Design a protein around this nucleic acid. Sequence first.
RNA 1: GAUAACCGCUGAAAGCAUCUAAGCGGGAAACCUCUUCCAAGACCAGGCUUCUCACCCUCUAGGAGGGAUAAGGCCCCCCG
RNA 2: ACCUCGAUGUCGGCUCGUCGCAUCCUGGGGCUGGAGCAGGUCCCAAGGGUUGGGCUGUUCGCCCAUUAAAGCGGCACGCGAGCUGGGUUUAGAACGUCGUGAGACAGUUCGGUCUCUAUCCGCCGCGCGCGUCAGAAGCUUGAGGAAACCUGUCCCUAGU
Lengths: 37, 146, 214, 60, 176
Amino acid sequence: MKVNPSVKPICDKCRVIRRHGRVMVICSDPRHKQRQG
Amino acid sequence: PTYTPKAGDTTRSWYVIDASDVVLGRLASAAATLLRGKHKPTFTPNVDGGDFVIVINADKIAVSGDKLTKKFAYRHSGYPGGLRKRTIGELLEKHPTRVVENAIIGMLPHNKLGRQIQKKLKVYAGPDHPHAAQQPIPFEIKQVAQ
Amino acid sequence: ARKGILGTKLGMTQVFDENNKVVPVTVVKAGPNVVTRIRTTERDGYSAVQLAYGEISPRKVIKPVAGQFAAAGVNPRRHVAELRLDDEAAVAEYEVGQELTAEIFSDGAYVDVTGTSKGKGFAGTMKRHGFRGQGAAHGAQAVHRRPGSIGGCATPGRVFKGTRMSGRMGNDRVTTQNLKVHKVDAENGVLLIKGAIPGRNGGLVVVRSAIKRG
Amino acid sequence: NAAARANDITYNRLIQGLKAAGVEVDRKNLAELAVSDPAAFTALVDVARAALPEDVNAPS
Amino acid sequence: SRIGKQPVPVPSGVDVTINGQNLSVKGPKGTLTLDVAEPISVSRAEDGAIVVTRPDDERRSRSLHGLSRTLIANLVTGVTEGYTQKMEIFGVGYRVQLKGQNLEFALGYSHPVLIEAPEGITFAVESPTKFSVSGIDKQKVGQISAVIRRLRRPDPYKGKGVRYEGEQIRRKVGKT
RNA sequence: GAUAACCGCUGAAAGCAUCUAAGCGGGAAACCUCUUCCAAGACCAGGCUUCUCACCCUCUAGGAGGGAUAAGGCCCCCCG
RNA sequence: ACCUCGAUGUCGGCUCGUCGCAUCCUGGGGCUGGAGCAGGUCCCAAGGGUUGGGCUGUUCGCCCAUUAAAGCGGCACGCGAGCUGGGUUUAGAACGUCGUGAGACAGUUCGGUCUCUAUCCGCCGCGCGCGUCAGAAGCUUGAGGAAACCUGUCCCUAGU
Ligand SMILES: CC[C@H]1OC(=O)[C@H](C)[C@@H](O[C@H]2C[C@@](C)(OC)[C@@H](O)[C@H](C)O2)[C@H](C)[C@@H](O[C@@H]2O[C@H](C)C[C@H](N(C)C)[C@H]2O)[C@](C)(O)C[C@@H](C)C(=O)[C@H](C)[C@@H](O)[C@]1(C)O
């Protein structure tokens, strides 16, 4: 998990979602898994 | 001279409020009004001329938003790091009457008369209370329109 | 659900195990306890059994206690103490006038022994809380056993509650847990409990079944 | 305000209605009526409610 | 509008048993009770399909209606034909057996991992490396299947562990 | 028992739909029970027992003011 | 340069703490830039614990032997009406540099008084008095509090 203030897609597979009042990036590549905090 | 309650002209009345599906703050405001006696034309701020207020179904009080888990009731024991916090939901689960009690007590004035007034509040975490002998009046919280 | 017996700390001694290992055992007179009263959730709101222990003279016993024992149906005894039980079947096991002997425990049973610790009197911080004493030499002026600092400065501005200071120590309830019962002398109504139990010799103790190592 | 809400009217609208009706009884004697003469206070409340506009919240 | 208002085809052998906004649908396989949310009601749409409609249309009623119809369909399907999740175990030495009402796994741990079948859940082992969970409540079936999945921390290297009937796990190969 | 990260639901307000959306269900030492101790001055003071279930006097015969006390307890005394 | 110069005592050490989390164990995600493993880097979730010595005025540090680890800070750089007085900063003296000199020196050194019976709050313990709707008596009963919470190797699992 990449916990940074800014989360963005790192590839075309990454999708930005908002789960539990929190912007996150979900991807088939776990390396690109991000979270806002 | 303005009217002043003398000796035993303070007549007391018993009300019972059903806290089922009622907002905690609204119920506490109405109960504090009744316990102060602000609803009586003979109200004098230095006199405990309020009314007894039973609160039934205190466990079934309603709280909006996330107060049931995000709002905390705090107590410091006087010892270092002795701050215990219990969410409204946990407090309602463990001591259900205590949420309504705390709301009403906080809405009451903090002084000797306020603590005397507290004694007229009877919160119960169920549909029934033991004060049927007092013949309490069912009190529905109704707003006076303008 | 949890056995227990009122007794007296007769003393302490040593026995030897089957492997010839020395076992320091407190000898406790787990004398007969008479069930005087049963606490129930219906009548009392909790489940407990009231036990009475020790021979006392009826002249010594006062009228309120004498009447309580009469209502129980048993002869008055010096001490009375309650054993709390979890469920109602535990008290369904008991009955007033019941005879509780040391045999309720068995050899090898782990018990919790509760007793009133010895009175150490007004103790200093070194004895009472293990405070590191200040230096015996190297300039130390009359602070060899004194607490040292008590608080901070202006910012707390006061001393916190629970500050470990000197005061009366001992004479408090202590429950030593998981003490093995080396032997149950049924003939003498005695228990040899491995280790030490709180209090002076002759003091009232409560030997309950171990709450942890049941 | 206690007497007014017992009469089913707020204090502010009671004062508005009394002013509209031209009743010049000061709050001292209004409270005196509220305590000692609830019937008279109810009569004044009726006067104030009658004098109030058909719609208190109207742009008027 | 229409995809949430899709009538739920109720089969012949079903008794939904409404009592307001709380259904208790019974069928060939067990019974399932659902406390429907605020929006919708139920009148069977005559033909037999539980009608699902929302009173207003802002956002919350929209979502609750879309989910209520979906859950009603899932519930009727579960009570009529049930649900099954077929799962397969990979890894030399990884194995599963059915010990009556419980499922035992050998997944390389020093101990065999036991799984107590919860109410409404039944395990059936087709082979020492293939099994399946079955139940009338697929929420619970999927939950227990997920527990069985998580039994072993993901092995991107060898693929050892449990999976589903068809799953292309995130494999991982490279240097020596 | 309740909680980060990991999930489940049929799958939408939204189309082969989709971790999940709004709703609803499951997985650390921290938290709440659990263990030990204090604790009803917990001003919201429990199940039992003891006497009694008023002994007398005075202003009023309202409300009080004092003795004697039943019950039990101090103080003395021998002590730890 | 806003309180304090009709005085708010300094550094260090001792003693005693208390708090924060900005993590030195306990839970996870990614990397598996371990393809893998023993390990480790990185980022998210305080209960406890977080050693003893030498050289250091030593605030810092370095070193020795350990450790699971030898955390970082706040609290008047916590704590001198609790201690010490090594540093520092009086009065003596020597040397170095400057000065004609008296003397000066964030120069090197030796020596160099640490007062107070606690009134208030606070805290640690003990009582006495009243309450607690009759006057006592044992047994209690948890609202609320406090205490505790640490963690190592070795073996089997498995030379898997
Ligand atoms: C035994 C008997 C004496 O005790 C001492 O000598 C102690 C040991 C001094 O400290 C010794 C030792 C030491 C280190 O103590 C602080 C030192 O600084 C002083 C100069 O001398 C004291 C306390 C000095 O105070 C301190 O003076 C400093 C100038 C400031 C300080 N405070 C205001 C900041 C202040 O309290 C001072 C001047 O003597 C106080 C005045 C009132 C006195 O003269 C009184 C009469 C003293 O003679 C005395 C108390 O009887």
